[PDB]
Curated annotation (Swiss-Prot), chain A:
It comes from the Eukaryota. Component of the class I major histocompatibility complex (MHC). Involved in the presentation of peptide antigens to the immune system. It is found in: Secreted. One of its GO terms (molecular function) is protein homodimerization activity. Its main location: secreted. GO terms for biological process: amyloid fibril formation; antigen processing and presentation of endogenous peptide antigen via MHC class I; antigen processing and presentation of exogenous protein antigen via MHC class Ib, TAP-dependent; cellular defense response; cellular response to iron(III) ion; cellular response to nicotine; intracellular iron ion homeostasis; iron ion transport. This is Beta-2-microglobulin. The keyword Methyltransferase does not apply. Heterodimer of an alpha chain and a beta chain. Beta-2-microglobulin is the beta-chain of major histocompatibility complex class I molecules. Forms a heterotrimer with MR1 and a metabolite antigen. The chain holds residues 21 to 119 of 119 of the full protein. One of its GO terms (cellular component) is Golgi apparatus. Disulfide bonds join 25-80. Residues 5-94 form the Ig-like C1-type domain.
Swiss-Prot record, chain B:
Glycans are attached at residues 1, 14, 36, 104, 159. During protein synthesis and maturation, CD1 family members bind endogenous lipids that are replaced by lipid or glycolipid antigens when the proteins are internalized and pass through endosomes, before trafficking back to the cell surface. Its main location: membrane. The chain holds residues 25 to 297 of 336 of the full protein. It is found in: Cell membrane; Endosome membrane; Lysosome membrane. This is Antigen-presenting glycoprotein CD1d1. It comes from Mus musculus. It comes from the Eukaryota. The gene is Cd1d1. GO terms for molecular function: endogenous lipid antigen binding; T cell receptor binding. Residues 183-265 form the Ig-like domain. Heterodimer with B2M (beta-2-microglobulin). Interacts with MHC II and CD74.
Length: 99, 267
């Protein structure tokens, strides 16, 4: 049966405003494996996002990691938005500026 | 201990469309991918061929190639014969490999899930349903067990090929498998958060401290992967404000020596 994705957003290096960094969006616990993942900068789709190969855990649920170059600043928001048959609407999780 | 796990994921949408993709891990490091759109198995490490020769690797690859076509045909044939009782879409996953233990020791496995639930395993010399699996699986599994050639090959692959190939991998991949990468930490925040990122291998200790005393309220989050074969973890501590003064996050990790990272809240 279907399992809804969990989404966590976190940065590879300490986030310091103005310093280039990598933002990660890890999407886990979902089934079936077909899914759509976008990373957003101020609500707009970021073009070059890299994804890992989809894989699954011991409990059979799927997972995938997306990541993109980004520069945190005082005025930009970032987010990860997922579309999946288990949800009526796309689900979006904002980076909290700390992680 | 290292576990080698070959993960196959096959999706069937209708009589006309399906795909199978696999990924292979040794411990927490990916060694291969095999995309449905690819004729051949891709290496994700310079040592992914282990100690096999180009010709053994080719024979082994050719068997898998044959298996991937056979698998697909056999499942579609199986859905036709059951129609209309087993409905599209169908999701089948297999996890197969071996776990290498202290000394010469290894154990192999082959588990199969259908619609996200474990239903079948290969054990001993045959395929079996696991208790609680749907009873329509009994007949096709009895049939597959009458296929002596497949049973011998699967027995060989699990009991012999797997451990031998993996010993070659651990030899060939030694310097990546034993790599050491140092974490960086930072603090944010009521709830104090110690973020620790970039460490490898996975074992790590992270704690909120006041002086010498470990703060028992420390909650370790989940380990989250970074995209460069390193790990991320945070540890959080709930604290009455003002009260933040004197706390530090301490990180102990093999890559650091005995030079722990110590970050004091308040600078
Ligand atoms: C590969 O290794 C297999 C063992 O390893 C397990 O499964 C594999 C796939 C991996 O996952 C691995 O990590 C696992 O540890 C090995 O399977 C073994 O095969 C032999 C036959 O070749 C089996 O022997 C027969 O056993 C039955 C008894 O079975 C029951 O009882 C035993 C315990 O008492 C249980 O362990 C079983 O699970 C069952 O509950 C006997 O009735 C039978 O005797 C009859 O046949 C023989 C001729 O072979 C005559 O000599 C006798 O007198 C009788 O007529 C056999 O002794 C053994 O059960 C089986 N193990 C398991 C767990 O099933 C496989 O053979 C290896 N294959 C190769 C090619 O290397
Ligand atoms: C995962 O991988 C597997 C295995 O590689 C894929 O399975 C194969 O998919 C291929 C490509 O679709 C398929 O080849 C078809 O065989 C058909 C008969 O069964 C042919 O009729 C068909 O030919 C048409 O398309 C070709 C290009 O793909 C054209 O070159 C050709 O001229 C044909 O074009 C005519 O007919 C088509 C309709 O098919 C039409 O659109 C055109 O306009 C024109 O009328 C293909 O050659 C194999 O049969 C499959 N091989 C298997 C199963 O072993 C599988 O699809 C992959 N899954 C995904 C999702 O990617
Ligand atoms: C079914 C037993 C598999 C274990 C045998 C160990 C041999 C190593 C194979 C490495 C590459 C395999 C790629 C996986 C192909 C697939 O699952 O469809
Ligand atoms: C089978 O499913 C595929 C994948 O969803 C879909 O695009 C298509 O409608 C189906 N193909 C046919 C011929 O119905």
């Amino acid at each position: 049966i279907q399992k809804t994705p969990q989404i966590q957003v976190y940065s590879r290096h300490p986030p310091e405003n103005g310093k280039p960094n990598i933002l990660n969006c890890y999407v886990t616990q979902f089934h079936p494996p077909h899914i759509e993942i976008q990373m957003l900068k101020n609500g707009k789709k970021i073009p070059k996002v890299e994804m890992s190969d989809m894989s699954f855990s011991k409990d059979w649920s799927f997972y995938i990691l997306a990541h993109t170059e980004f520069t945190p600043t005082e005025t930009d928001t970032y987010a990860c938005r997922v579309k999946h048959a288990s949800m009526a609407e796309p689900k979006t999780v904002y980076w909290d500026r700390d992680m | 201990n290292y576990t080698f796990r070959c993960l196959q994921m096959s999706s069937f949408a209708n009589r006309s469309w399906s795909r199978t993709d696999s990924v292979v891990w040794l411990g927490d490091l990916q060694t291969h991918r095999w995309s449905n759109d690819s004729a051949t198995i891709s290496f994700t490490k310079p040592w992914s061929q282990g100690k096999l020769s180009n010709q053994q690797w080719e024979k082994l690859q050719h068997m898998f190639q044959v298996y991937r076509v056979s698998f697909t045909r056999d499942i579609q044939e199986l859905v036709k014969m059951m129609s209309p009782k087993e409905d599209y879409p169908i999701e089948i996953q297999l996890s197969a490999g071996c776990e290498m233990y202290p000394g010469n020791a290894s154990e192999s496995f082959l588990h199969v899930a259908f619609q996200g639930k474990y239903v079948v395993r290969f054990w001993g010399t045959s395929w079996q349903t696991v208790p609680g699996a749907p009873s329509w699986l009994d007949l096709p599994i009895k049939v597959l067990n009458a296929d002596q050639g497949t049973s011998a090959t699967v027995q060989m692959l699990l009991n012999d090929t797997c451990p031998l190939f993996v010993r070659g991998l651990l030899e060939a991949g030694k310097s990546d498998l034993e790599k050491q990468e140092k974490p960086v930490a930072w603090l944010s925040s009521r709830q104090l958060v110690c973020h620790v990122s970039g460490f490898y291998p996975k074992p790590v200790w992270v704690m909120w401290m006041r002086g010498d005393q470990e703060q028992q309220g420390t909650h370790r989050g989940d380990f989250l992967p970074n995209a460069d074969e390193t790990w991320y973890l945070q540890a959080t501590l709930d604290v009455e404000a003002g009260e933040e003064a004197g706390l530090a996050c301490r990180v102990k990790h093999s890559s650091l020596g005995g030079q722990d990272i110590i970050l004091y809240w308040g600078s």
